[PDB]
Amino acid sequence: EEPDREKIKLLTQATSEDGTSASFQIVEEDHTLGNALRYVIMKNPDVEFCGYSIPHPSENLLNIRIQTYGETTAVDALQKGLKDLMDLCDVVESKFTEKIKSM
Amino acid sequence: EWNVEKFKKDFEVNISSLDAREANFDLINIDTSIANAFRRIMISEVPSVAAEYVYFFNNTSVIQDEVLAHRIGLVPLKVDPDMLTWVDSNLPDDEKFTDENTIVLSLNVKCTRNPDAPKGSTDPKELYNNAHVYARDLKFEPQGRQSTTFADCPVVPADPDILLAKLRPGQEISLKAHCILGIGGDHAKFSPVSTASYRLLPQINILQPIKGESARRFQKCFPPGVIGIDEGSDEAYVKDARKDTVSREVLRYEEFADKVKLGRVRNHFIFNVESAGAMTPEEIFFKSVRILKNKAEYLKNCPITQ
Amino acid sequence: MIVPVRCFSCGKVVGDKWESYLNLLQEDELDEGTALSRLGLKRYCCRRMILTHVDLIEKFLRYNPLEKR
Amino acid sequence: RGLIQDHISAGVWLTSKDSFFTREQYQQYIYGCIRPEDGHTTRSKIVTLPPTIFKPYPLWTGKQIITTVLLNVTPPDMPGINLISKNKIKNEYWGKGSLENEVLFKDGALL
Amino acid sequence: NTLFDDIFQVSEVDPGRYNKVCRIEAASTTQDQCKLTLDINVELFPVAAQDSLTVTIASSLNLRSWRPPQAGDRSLADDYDYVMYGTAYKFEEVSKDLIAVYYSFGGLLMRLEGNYRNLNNLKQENAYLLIRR
Numbered sequence: 263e264e265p266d267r268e269k270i271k272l273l274t275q276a277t278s279e280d281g282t283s284a285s286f287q288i289v290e291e292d293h294t295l296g297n298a299l300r301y302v303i304m305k306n307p308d309v310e311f312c313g314y315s316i317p318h319p320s321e322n323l324l325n326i327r328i329q330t331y332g333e334t335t336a337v338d339a340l341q342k343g344l345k346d347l348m349d350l351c352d353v354v355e356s357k358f359t360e361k362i363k364s365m
Numbered sequence: 366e367w368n369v370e371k372f373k374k375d376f377e378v379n380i381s382s383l384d385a386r387e388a389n390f391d392l393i394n395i396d397t398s399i400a401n402a403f404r405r406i407m408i409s410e411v412p413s414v415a416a417e418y419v420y421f422f423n424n425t426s427v428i429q430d431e432v433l434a435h436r437i438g439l440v441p442l443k444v445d446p447d448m449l450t451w452v453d454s455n456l457p458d459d460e461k462f463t464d465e466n467t468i469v470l471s472l473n474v475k476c477t478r479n480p481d482a483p484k485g486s487t488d489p490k491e492l493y494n495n496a497h498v499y500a501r502d503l504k505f506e507p508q509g510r511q512s513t514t515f516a517d518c519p520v521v522p523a524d525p526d527i528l529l530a531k532l533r534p535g536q537e538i539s540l541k542a543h544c545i546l547g548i549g550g551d552h553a554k555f556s557p558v559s560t561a562s563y564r565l566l567p568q569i570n571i572l573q574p575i576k577g578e579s580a581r582r583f584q585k586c587f588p589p590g591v592i593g594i595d596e597g598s599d600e601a602y603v604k605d606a607r608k609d610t611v612s613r614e615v616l617r618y619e620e621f622a623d624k625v626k627l628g629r630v631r632n633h634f635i636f637n638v639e640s641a642g643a644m645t646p647e648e649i650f651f652k653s654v655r656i657l658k659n660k661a662e663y664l665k666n667c668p669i670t671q
Numbered sequence: 672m673i674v675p676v677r678c679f680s681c682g683k684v685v686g687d688k689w690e691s692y693l694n695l696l697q698e699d700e701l702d703e704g705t706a707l708s709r710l711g712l713k714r715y716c717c718r719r720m721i722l723t724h725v726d727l728i729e730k731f732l733r734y735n736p737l738e739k740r
Numbered sequence: 741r742g743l744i745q746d747h748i749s750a751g752v753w754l755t756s757k758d759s760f761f762t763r764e765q766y767q768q769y770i771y772g773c774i775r776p777e778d779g780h781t782t783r784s785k786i787v788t789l790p791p792t793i794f795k796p797y798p799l800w801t802g803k804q805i806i807t808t809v810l811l812n813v814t815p816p817d818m819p820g821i822n823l824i825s826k827n828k829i830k831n832e833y834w835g836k837g838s839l840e841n842e843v844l845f846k847d848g849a850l851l
Numbered sequence: 852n853t854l855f856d857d858i859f860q861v862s863e864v865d866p867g868r869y870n871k872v873c874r875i876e877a878a879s880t881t882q883d884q885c886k887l888t889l890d891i892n893v894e895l896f897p898v899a900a901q902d903s904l905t906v907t908i909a910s911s912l913n914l915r916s917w918r919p920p921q922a923g924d925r926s927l928a929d930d931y932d933y934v935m936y937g938t939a940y941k942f943e944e945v946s947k948d949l950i951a952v953y954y955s956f957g958g959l960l961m962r963l964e965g966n967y968r969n970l971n972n973l974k975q976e977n978a979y980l981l982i983r984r
């Protein structure tokens with residue numbers, strides 16, 4: 263129920279104050295979400311740099327760093343990623359259902 | 366410029382074959398990260414229902430208790446995993462297992478001898494009684510609610526013929542397995558698919574045409590039906606590049622390795638999802654894509670912490 | 672020990688296909704290859720699972736100490 | 741103390757003039773190898789180079805990747821290391837006119 | 852601005868041992884002392900012997916950062932087909948006048964040979980290489 267306070271964390275060591283460079287750490291994730299999320303994030307024209315890195319397979323951790331220019335915030339750019347992934351997966355599900363029905 | 370609607374314009378699905386146990390379908394115009402996301406999730410993250418806690422009361426068989434417990438874990442059950450929620454761990458064993466989160470399977474087999482077969486070994490099944498312990502001997506034991514809920518979906522192993530153990534007269538197996546909801550990532554017994562894999566569509570770029578008996582001689586180098594020749598006096602054509610296996614056998618011959626290129630279609634993905642019976646493979650794919658979406662909703666909803 | 676439930680490499684349940692496979696090598700006088708083709712073990716990870724199996728339990732079971740001999 | 745087996749053959753493959761990488765791939769390899777949150781840098785942000793090929797498509801070399809990592813691990817207050825070394829691979833193997841045994845480092849950039 | 856511009860006739864196309872790079876040997880049609888040796892990705896920019904390439908070296912694409920294209924603006928690359936950004940790393944003298952300049956575009960090397968024209972091609976931290984076809 264509570265807003266998960268430990269899923270995503272903003273690594274102060276890796277975040278600008280002006281507003282366009284952060285490293286986020288998500289627990290219990292890997293390439294599964296990571297590579298898709300960075301892929302959609304790279305579609306954002308305002309992302310300069312984005313990528314994900316696993317500190318260690320055994321640790322079950324995912325760090326994803328987004329540094330942009332002054333035309334977007336890294337939190338905003340990430341939300342743009344997640345809205346794109348949700349809507350895109352809606353597209354996949356919708357066409358898959360349609361072709362399942364067409365048979 | 367890129368938008369999600371230009372993807373929806375560009376994304377395609379083509380379903381070649383939909384069996385109640387296998388689905389072979391294509392995802393055209395997608396990113397490898399997404400096809401691999403669906404594959405990875407279909408394998409590790411899609412929940413399935415499998416035996417987890419086997420409680421033995423007696424095992425006189427020549428098979429090790431632990432081993433038999435693992436084997437009972439491996440048996441896939443024909444259970445719609447949505448009939449049950451997850452079992453927590455923060456709480457005592459008395460609260461862990463309820464009729465909302467656990468399925469009970471009893472196994473009570475006692476091996477005997479039969480009154481005198483014909484010759485002797487006349488196998489095992491005639492010399493002995495209940496000599497073969499199968500997964501079909503896992504009797505489903507409901508509790509209350511789920512007793513009614515399964516009135517029209519009783520619990521059965523998705524393959525009753527699985528041999529679980531072999532006994533001898535006087536040997537006996539009595540155990541009670543607690544089947545829970547789990548994901549294939551935490552242990553491979555919870556993976557609902559046997560094989561969920563993708564392969565890029567092979568592309569056979571013929572750089573210069575081949576004809577006559579060199580064209581048919583090229584045709585026999587590939588799987589029977591990949592390369593078609595209609596006349597061969599003018600071309601040696603590709604009936605279907607999807608039939609090919611990329612054995613790259615054609616490159617063994619200079620007749621071709623300088624007049625053909627073998628590539629792939631980065632956008633076109635050929636998925637093959639075969640189910641272990643717990644669920645139909647397409648329904649498993651639906652759960653995988655709805656799982657990725659649910660994960661993106663979880664990340665939208667979460668507050669960025671610091 | 673006993674025919675594995677699943678093929679280590681792939682994941683397809685195979686433990687149900689042992690006795691019929693052995694019947695197909697005896698009763699139908701088939702060959703191991705064709706028997707595995709009719710069993711649906713169309714991958715070598717599966718092919719090898721049953722093809723190479725050594726059901727040593729039959730040798731173990733004759734040592735059952737719970738019956739007179 | 742140095743890298744071994746696979747890391748050596750990987751460096752041989754990555755550093756070939758034949759290895760190109762898209763912006764996505766390049767940046768991914770970079771954050772894959774550099775974590776500023778881990779104190780892996782002297783910048784507290786990330787910096788990047790122009791692509792090797794501006795044309796049809798923006799393309800980075802593997803040598804540009806080694807340039808980016810060296811540009812990111814060395815302190816910004818210092819000029820790039822300048823070195824003329826050699827390889828264990830004769831130039832003849834890369835072609836009749838190829839020149840690949842001279843290892844050239846100019847101001848932090850493998851050229 | 853531009854530093855050197857010419858139409859080159861390709862005299863050799865050697866793929867070496869590579870699948871998408873080739874070392875091209877070309878000579879200028881317009882000056883007997885202008886020579887070129889450049890490694891190009893023929894997979895992006897296919898080339899053949901005896902073919903007409905319009906090589907231009909410029910100091911910038913102008914008509915600290917890099918941006919993907921935007922259809923709101925164009926550069927000198929809008930005029931040419933193949934663009935590389937590289938650095939000059941060696942200046943060798945072939946005569947009391949002949950001088951050969953060396954650029955590296957992340958390891959895609961170029962060797963221009965000349966004698967006097969170089970003087971608009973002095974060493975710089977960057978050189979844009981533009982090719983037309």
Ligand SMILES: [Zn+2]
Pocket residue numbers: 678679680681682683714715716717718720
């Ligand atoms: Zn297998």
